[PDB]
Design an enzyme around this catalytic site. Structure first.
Site, PDB file in Angstrom:
ATOM      1  CG  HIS A  41      -0.630   0.358   2.477  1.00 33.92           C
ATOM      2  ND1 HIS A  41      -0.528  -0.608   3.454  1.00 33.92           N
ATOM      3  CD2 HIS A  41      -0.405   1.568   3.043  1.00 33.92           C
ATOM      4  CE1 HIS A  41      -0.208   0.034   4.564  1.00 33.92           C
ATOM      5  NE2 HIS A  41      -0.131   1.345   4.370  1.00 33.92           N
ATOM      6  CG  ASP A  89      -0.545  -3.826   2.954  1.00 34.88           C
ATOM      7  OD1 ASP A  89       0.314  -3.371   2.168  1.00 34.88           O
ATOM      8  OD2 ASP A  89      -1.171  -3.118   3.756  1.00 34.88           O
ATOM      9  CB  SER A 185       2.605   1.057   6.314  1.00 33.97           C
ATOM     10  OG  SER A 185       1.453   1.671   6.862  1.00 33.97           O
TER      11      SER A 185
HETATM   12  C1  LIG Z   1       0.039   2.435   5.203  1.00 28.16           C
HETATM   13  C2  LIG Z   1       0.410   2.694   6.678  1.00 28.16           C
HETATM   14  O1  LIG Z   1       1.085   3.962   6.783  1.00 28.16           O
HETATM   15  C3  LIG Z   1      -0.842   2.732   7.586  1.00 28.16           C
HETATM   16  C4  LIG Z   1      -0.419   2.481   9.052  1.00 28.16           C
HETATM   17  C5  LIG Z   1      -1.617   2.382  10.002  1.00 28.16           C
HETATM   18  C6  LIG Z   1      -1.953   3.721  10.670  1.00 28.16           C
HETATM   19  C7  LIG Z   1      -3.385   3.633  11.210  1.00 28.16           C
HETATM   20  N1  LIG Z   1      -3.605   4.545  12.342  1.00 28.16           N
HETATM   21  N2  LIG Z   1      -1.980   1.888   7.107  1.00 28.16           N
HETATM   22  C8  LIG Z   1      -3.095   2.395   6.521  1.00 28.16           C
HETATM   23  O2  LIG Z   1      -3.162   3.598   6.368  1.00 28.16           O
HETATM   24  C9  LIG Z   1      -4.217   1.473   6.053  1.00 28.16           C
HETATM   25  C10 LIG Z   1      -4.414   1.580   4.537  1.00 28.16           C
HETATM   26  C11 LIG Z   1      -4.019   0.385   3.659  1.00 28.16           C
HETATM   27  C12 LIG Z   1      -5.011   0.371   2.519  1.00 28.16           C
HETATM   28  C13 LIG Z   1      -4.071  -1.008   4.303  1.00 28.16           C
HETATM   29  N3  LIG Z   1      -5.559   1.751   6.609  1.00 28.16           N
HETATM   30  C14 LIG Z   1      -5.852   1.902   7.927  1.00 28.16           C
HETATM   31  O3  LIG Z   1      -5.004   1.864   8.791  1.00 28.16           O
HETATM   32  C15 LIG Z   1      -7.267   2.141   8.386  1.00 28.16           C
HETATM   33  N4  LIG Z   1      -8.252   1.239   7.736  1.00 28.16           N
HETATM   34  C16 LIG Z   1      -7.631   3.635   8.506  1.00 28.16           C
HETATM   35  C17 LIG Z   1      -6.511   4.485   9.155  1.00 28.16           C
HETATM   36  C18 LIG Z   1      -7.973   4.241   7.133  1.00 28.16           C
END
Ligand SMILES: *C[C@@](*)(O)[C@H](CCCCN)NC(=O)[C@H](CC(C)C)NC(=O)[C@H](N)C(C)C
Ligand SMILES: *[C@@H]1O[C@H](CO)[C@@H](O[C@@H]2O[C@H](CO)[C@@H](O)[C@H](O)[C@H]2NC(C)=O)[C@H](O)[C@H]1NC(C)=O
Ligand SMILES: *[C@@H]1O[C@H](CO)[C@@H](O)[C@H](O)[C@H]1NC(C)=O
EC number: 3.4.21.-
Length: 233
Positions: A41, A89, A185
């Site tokens: 992602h 992911d 992430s």
């Molecule tokens: C991608 C990474 O920076 C983040 C880390 C988690 C922070 C959450 N407080 N992951 C995401 O942003 C993912 C999105 C990907 C599509 C898997 N989404 C989420 O964490 C949640 N469903 C919400 C924060 C939108």
């Protein structure tokens, strides 16, 4: 990283900082001198040539001598990565050159092919340069939090059955909010000195028990990872 502490500078040498447009975007880990593992992602809607993988860092903002910056020669995202579902992911990054191993730039090991995910209760650690709170607050350098693997049946209920067999969860070892935040992430969930998970998604607010931290179960991907690695010499 929420409910964490700043690490001893260069105490986690495998940590990669994926940066887009000067700003640090995601975490990752050094698998081999040419290879970095991350979340699929992170690369969504990005032009790779705007990105650099930074190794040997602690204070990302400072240009340290320990630092080594590389470009992404090729990005292999998991073929089955699904937005909406967030499954698979995981992605691999082939750098434009091999990293020089030193006491600040090092490798992290995957679990064997003969590996089941860590049991509910296992002490694990999650590092990163992402936010330290729900108020866009930046860390003073690489931070780490001590977490404990959470029962998947428990995690699946909290997540209204949106969890797949290839995901794994954590919870704080106590009452405080501990775990990952935005820009964490791709970074690895180290359990028993092996990359057991990879920071995927969480709820709205960081470390919120009602929405436990979800990771990619690395062991389920070990075969794929190697396949890709041996594919590109
Ligand atoms: C991608 C990474 O920076 C983040 C880390 C988690 C922070 C959450 N407080 N992951 C995401 O942003 C993912 C999105 C990907 C599509 C898997 N989404 C989420 O964490 C949640 N469903 C919400 C924060 C939108
Ligand atoms: C590896 O990839 C990067 C990114 O594409 C290359 O980019 C150089 O990076 C510096 C800053 O880090 C820029 O100021 C230079 O203008 C970039 N040079 C080029 C040729 O685009 C980097 O040069 C690459 N390294 C190797 C050895 O190929
Ligand atoms: C989570 O729950 C759903 C619905 O009950 C089920 O289909 C799915 O296989 C479960 N996954 C895990 C990781 O337990």
């Amino acid at each position: 990283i929420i409910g964490g502490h700043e690490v001893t500078p260069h105490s986690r040498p495998y940590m990669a900082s994926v940066r887009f447009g000067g700003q640090h975007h995601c975490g990752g880990f050094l698998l081999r001198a040419r290879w970095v593992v991350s979340a699929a992602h992170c690369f969504s809607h990005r032009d790779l040539r705007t990105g650099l993988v930074v190794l040997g860092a602690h204070v990302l903002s400072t240009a340290e001598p320990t630092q080594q910056v590389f470009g992404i020669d090729a990005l292999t995202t998991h073929p089955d990565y699904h937005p909406m579902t967030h499954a698979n992911d995981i992605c691999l990054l082939r750098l434009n050159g091999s990293a020089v191993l030193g006491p600040a730039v090092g490798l992290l090991r995957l679990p064997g092919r003969r590996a089941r995910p860590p049991t509910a209760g296992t002490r694990c650690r999650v590092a990163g340069w992402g936010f330290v709170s729900d108020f866009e607050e930046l860390p003073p350098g690489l931070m780490e939090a001590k977490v404990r693997v959470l029962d998947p049946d428990v995690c699946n209920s909290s997540w209204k059955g949106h969890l797949t067999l290839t995901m794994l969860c954590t919870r704080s070892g106590d009452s405080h909010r501990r775990g990952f935040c935005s820009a964490d992430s791709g970074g690895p969930l180290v359990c028993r000195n092996r990359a057991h998970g990879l920071v995927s998604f969480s709820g709205l607010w960081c470390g919120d028990p009602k929405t436990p931290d979800v990771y990619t179960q690395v062991s389920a991907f070990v075969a794929w990872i190697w396949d890709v690695v041996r594919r590109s010499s």
